[PDB]
Amino acid sequence: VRKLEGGALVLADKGVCLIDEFDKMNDQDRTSIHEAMEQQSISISKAGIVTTLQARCSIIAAANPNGGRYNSTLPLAQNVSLTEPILSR
Amino acid sequence: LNHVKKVDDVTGEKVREAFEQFLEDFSVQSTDTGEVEKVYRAQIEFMKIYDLNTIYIDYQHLSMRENGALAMAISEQYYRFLPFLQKGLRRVVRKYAPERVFQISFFNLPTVHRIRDIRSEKIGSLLSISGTVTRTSEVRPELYKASFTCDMCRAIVDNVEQSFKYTEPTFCPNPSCENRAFWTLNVTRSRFLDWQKVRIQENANEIPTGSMPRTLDVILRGDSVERAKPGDRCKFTGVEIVVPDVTQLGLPGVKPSSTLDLTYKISFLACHVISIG
Amino acid sequence: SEIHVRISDFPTIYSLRELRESNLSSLVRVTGVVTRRTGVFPQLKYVKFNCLLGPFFQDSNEEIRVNGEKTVYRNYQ
Amino acid sequence: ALPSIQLPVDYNNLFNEITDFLVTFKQDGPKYMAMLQKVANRELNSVIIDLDDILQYQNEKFLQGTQADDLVSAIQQNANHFTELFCRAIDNNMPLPTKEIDYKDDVLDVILNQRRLRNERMLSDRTNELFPPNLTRRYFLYFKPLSQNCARRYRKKAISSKPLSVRQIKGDFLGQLITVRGIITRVSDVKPAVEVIAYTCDQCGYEVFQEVNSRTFTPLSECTSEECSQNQTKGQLFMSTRASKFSAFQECKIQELSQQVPVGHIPRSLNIHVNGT
Amino acid sequence: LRIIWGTNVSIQECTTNFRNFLMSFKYKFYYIKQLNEMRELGTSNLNLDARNLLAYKQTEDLYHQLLNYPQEVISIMDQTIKDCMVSLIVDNNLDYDLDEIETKFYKVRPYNVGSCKGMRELNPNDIDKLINLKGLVLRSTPVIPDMKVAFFKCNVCDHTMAVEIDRGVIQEPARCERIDCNEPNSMSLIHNRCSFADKQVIKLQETPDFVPDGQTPHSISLCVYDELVDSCRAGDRIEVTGTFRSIPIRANSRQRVLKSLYKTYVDVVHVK
Ligand SMILES: [Zn+2]
Numbered sequence: 007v008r009k010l011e012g013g014a015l016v017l018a019d020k021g022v023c024l025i026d027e028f029d030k031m032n033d034q035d036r037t038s039i040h041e042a043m044e045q046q047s048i049s050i051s052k053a054g055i056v057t058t059l060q061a062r063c064s065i066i067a068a069a070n071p072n073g074g075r076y077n078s079t080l081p082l083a084q085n086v087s088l089t090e091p092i093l094s095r
Numbered sequence: 096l097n098h099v100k101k102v103d104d105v106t107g108e109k110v111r112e113a114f115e116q117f118l119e120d121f122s123v124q125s126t127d128t129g130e131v132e133k134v135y136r137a138q139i140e141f142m143k144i145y146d147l148n149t150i151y152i153d154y155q156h157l158s159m160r161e162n163g164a165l166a167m168a169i170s171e172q173y174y175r176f177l178p179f180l181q182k183g184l185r186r187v188v189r190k191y192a193p194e195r196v197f198q199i200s201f202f203n204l205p206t207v208h209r210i211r212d213i214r215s216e217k218i219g220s221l222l223s224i225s226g227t228v229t230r231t232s233e234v235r236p237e238l239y240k241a242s243f244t245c246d247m248c249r250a251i252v253d254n255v256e257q258s259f260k261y262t263e264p265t266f267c268p269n270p271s272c273e274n275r276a277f278w279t280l281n282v283t284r285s286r287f288l289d290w291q292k293v294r295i296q297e298n299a300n301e302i303p304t305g306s307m308p309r310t311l312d313v314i315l316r317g318d319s320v321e322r323a324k325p326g327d328r329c330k331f332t333g334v335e336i337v338v339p340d341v342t343q344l345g346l347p348g349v350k351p352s353s354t355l356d357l358t359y360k361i362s363f364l365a366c367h368v369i370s371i372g
Numbered sequence: 373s374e375i376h377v378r379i380s381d382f383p384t385i386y387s388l389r390e391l392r393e394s395n396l397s398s399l400v401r402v403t404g405v406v407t408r409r410t411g412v413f414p415q416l417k418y419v420k421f422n423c424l425l426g427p428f429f430q431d432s433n434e435e436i437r438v439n440g441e442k443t444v445y446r447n448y449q
Numbered sequence: 450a451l452p453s454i455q456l457p458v459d460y461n462n463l464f465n466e467i468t469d470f471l472v473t474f475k476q477d478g479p480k481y482m483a484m485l486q487k488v489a490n491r492e493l494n495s496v497i498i499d500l501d502d503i504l505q506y507q508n509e510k511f512l513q514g515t516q517a518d519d520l521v522s523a524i525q526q527n528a529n530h531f532t533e534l535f536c537r538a539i540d541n542n543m544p545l546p547t548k549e550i551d552y553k554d555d556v557l558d559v560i561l562n563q564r565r566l567r568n569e570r571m572l573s574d575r576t577n578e579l580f581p582p583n584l585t586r587r588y589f590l591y592f593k594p595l596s597q598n599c600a601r602r603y604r605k606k607a608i609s610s611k612p613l614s615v616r617q618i619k620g621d622f623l624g625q626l627i628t629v630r631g632i633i634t635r636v637s638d639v640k641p642a643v644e645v646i647a648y649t650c651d652q653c654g655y656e657v658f659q660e661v662n663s664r665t666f667t668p669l670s671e672c673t674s675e676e677c678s679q680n681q682t683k684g685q686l687f688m689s690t691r692a693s694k695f696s697a698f699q700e701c702k703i704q705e706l707s708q709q710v711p712v713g714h715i716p717r718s719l720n721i722h723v724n725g726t
Numbered sequence: 727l728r729i730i731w732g733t734n735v736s737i738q739e740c741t742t743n744f745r746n747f748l749m750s751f752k753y754k755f756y757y758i759k760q761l762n763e764m765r766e767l768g769t770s771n772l773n774l775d776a777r778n779l780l781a782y783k784q785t786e787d788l789y790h791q792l793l794n795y796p797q798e799v800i801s802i803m804d805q806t807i808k809d810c811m812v813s814l815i816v817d818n819n820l821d822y823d824l825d826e827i828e829t830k831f832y833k834v835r836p837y838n839v840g841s842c843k844g845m846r847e848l849n850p851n852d853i854d855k856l857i858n859l860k861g862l863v864l865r866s867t868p869v870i871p872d873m874k875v876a877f878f879k880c881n882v883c884d885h886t887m888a889v890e891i892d893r894g895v896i897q898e899p900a901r902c903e904r905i906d907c908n909e910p911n912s913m914s915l916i917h918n919r920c921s922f923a924d925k926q927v928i929k930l931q932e933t934p935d936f937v938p939d940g941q942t943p944h945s946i947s948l949c950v951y952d953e954l955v956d957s958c959r960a961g962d963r964i965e966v967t968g969t970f971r972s973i974p975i976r977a978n979s980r981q982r983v984l985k986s987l988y989k990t991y992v993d994v995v996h997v998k
Pocket residue numbers: 650651652653654655672674676677684
């Protein structure tokens with residue numbers, strides 16, 4: 007709520023949310039995407055306004071492997087920076 | 096108890112007649128294809144259509160009549176003439192026309208002055224102030240004129256209370272309540288108007304960073320309410336006045352007191368707005 | 373023992389930001405999003421007691437110028 | 450209604466013993482004549498009173514009679530009261546001329562000089578209750594601790610002057626001189642304090658001096674002067690800053706040295722007020 | 727000789743001692759040249775020099791009268807330079823058309839009286855004195871309006887008579903004006919109609935180059951007045967002169983009681 011507005015998620019509900027370069031995302035956003043995937047709703051507690059908006063969006067993502075084209079024989083989760091639990095979603 | 100009588104207004108009456116005659120008479124330069132007749136009688140008559148209870152007259156026209164000598168009484172001493180310019184104007188309307196709130200807004204001042212150029216000599220005087228708006232606020236009613244009474248208990252006195260305190264009604268009553276007593280607040284008999292505050296800030300192109308530009312309050316009273324927009328430069332009608340306020344511990348002081356304390360600051364007024372700039 | 377009438381659409385249809393003094397005391401339609409609401413706190417409304425002055429209606433909303441025995445409360449929000 | 454119970458200590462004859470302590474002296478002419486006159490000569494302000502010499506005097510006044518009441522215990526027992534008592538005695542023995550004092554020379558001394566000149570003149574004319582002794586000082590009395598190399602006299606338990614822990618400090622040391630030690634904390638910057646502040650009246654003049662007691666005082670207006678009073682009607686009076694006597698004031702808190710802190714707890718600071726020199 | 731209270735700087739004495747100060751180089755070890763420059767522009771604000779009166783005789787003592795008592799000395803100095811303008815005009819006969827140019831307000835702006843050491847060193851014994859100061863400005867406060875001539879009203883009849891403030895207080899007559907009328911009812915003070923004069927406030931750190939190290943510098947708020955207001959911005963490390971002031975502050979809250987420790991600020995008559 008800025009001097010109310012949804013992120014891409016709320017805005018795109020029922021539609022398709024399109025994100026790229028996860029790796030460059032500040033954690034502050036990362037938690038938001040995680041929550042959205044998890045419960046299919048974004049909750050906002052600030053300032054006085056208190057709700058749960060509903061983003062049902064399909065997330066399509068573009069991610070960039072750590073360093074080179076194929077970083078290692080090592081598994082995908084090892085290949086890229088994004089943690090395994092967010093990836094499991 | 097008869098009130099004997101009232102005094103004296105002197106020059107105020109001269110300015111009443113001059114301003115009345117001015118708003119009446121041309122006030123016309125152009126000839127042949129005009130821009131002729133009147134324009135101010137035609138202004139009020141055009142105003143009869145929507146009946147929004149405001150008028151627009153140019154200062155440049157007002158300076159032309161006496162060669163600016165008329166505009167001087169209306170310049171530095173201006174706020175002295177606010178009750179006279181209004182009722183006087185009504186004395187015109189009653190003649191030419193058939194629920195009266197009238198907001199007079201002058202415009203087109205010869206020179207625009209910055210907030211930095213604001214002085215304590217400019218008080219009570221029209222000054223055009225240019226700068227960007229910050230922190231607009233929601234419109235709420237002013238008490239304007241009120242009936243607050245009785246006030247012990249049947250009086251029902253409706254008068255004055257125009258100045259901003261708002262305390263108090265019921266003083267020098269009824270005849271005769273002798274309240275004291277309750278104030279007492281009655282909001283159904285009291286006409287309201289406007290208003291929205293905007294905090295005006297100097298434009299960033301003029302200010303020599305390192306600056307830290309100094310904002311100042313301008314409250315919009317009048318039908319020019321809501322005409323202002325955030326992030327944009329606006330020109331206003333001056334009426335600088337002052338408003339009382341609670342300053343931080345070290346001022347450092349100490350301003351005087353009224354004894355049988357007062358703390359004041361510049362709060363600029365605008366009765367007219369434009370998007371120029 | 374009281375039914376207050378709901379009175380469906382009444383244009384007007386002033387939105388929010390457009391409002392003036394002219395709207396005082398006069399019913400006006402408004403529209404927009406809700407923001408988080410207070411919990412339900414019973415308001416005083418009617419006053420009654422076994423004696424012991426009589427019933428005093430207060431108010432919307434002043435309350436000037438307390439006993440209670442059986443008072444008819446009505447939820448406020 | 451507020452009972453009274455006698456104590457063996459009496460300040461009346463103790464003052465007498467102070468007077469015998471001052472200006473009558475041998476062991477160190479005497480030191481209290483020169484040390485006092487150099488202040489009277491206005492090259493010096495701080496009067497450093499050593500309790501060591503007070504110790505030396507009793508020997509001459511006891512054994513070596515004729516025997517007298519004790520001070521060194523009686524001072525540090527109270528030690529606030531003596532600042533208003535032991536120090537006022539200096540006024541009675543002080544050299545009057547003293548030498549080459551003039552008037553200006555000094556700022557603000559001319560003020561009071563003209564006060565007493567116009568007061569003397571106008572009083573001597575009227576007859577054809579005085580300015581407080583604390584306004585006319587321009588010097589400060591400071592006691593010092595007895596450690597001491599000569600404390601071995603011995604008066605033994607007489608010493609505080611016991612370089613004690615901040616923890617050692619008790620509510621039973623209030624109103625008793627105590628040495629303490631620790632690191633200076635926060636050392637607030639100097640500001641002027643106030644003592645008398647005699648406000649000036651208007652019509653018939655005179656003066657009145659309001660005592661500055663404890664931390665704060667309430668300012669008064671009315672009129673104290675009998676002339677302005679009741680006819681006609683109450684004379685207005687304002688404080689004059691030039692006339693007031695200012696004593697430097699600086700406060701600072703002192704935490705313990707932390708070696709004096711036990712295995713537990715926390716460093717505890719102690720607030721300390723400073724005056725004069 | 728007209729003794730004036732405790733300041734004891736005599737009227738009809740120092741005025742003439744300053745009046746014959748005119749026309750001097752001299753000395754040095756300008757003066758009338760710069761004044762003759764001043765009369766055309768109408769800029770007023772005579773900046774003076776300081777030091778002039780020292781070592782020059784007469785008025786070796788006037789330097790000490792100003793330094794020790796600047797309050798009166800500045801007012802008298804302004805009166806005298808005004809009447810020396812008046813006496814400058816009669817010399818050239820009809821000037822500037824005519825007498826109105828003398829009516830305009832003038833003032834002396836003394837500066838550089840001795841070299842004072844810091845704010846920090848200052849004794850509480852000198853509260854009316856001219857005091858050099860130096861340090862950056864952390865902020866320039868918004869302009870506060872200051873009472874000069876007060877206006878008053880009543881329910882009867884209503885009448886327009888008003889009284890000047892003079893000293894830092896305001897006393898309105900209980901009853902009443904013009905006439906009479908009376909009654910006892912309290913005076914109505916119009917807030918906006920009365921005159922005002924510009925008072926800024928300027929925060930100043932004490933010489934950040936000169937410090938106890940590491941203790942952070944002490945604030946000195948100098949309030950200025952008139953033309954000087956809004957003549958500066960921030961961070962100016964140069965120097966300022968003016969009269970020291972200790973004034974009581976109202977404490978807790980309400981109560982109408984004095985905290986008994988007077989706050990200290992500088993009148994700062996000149997800036998350079
Ligand atoms: Zn008096």
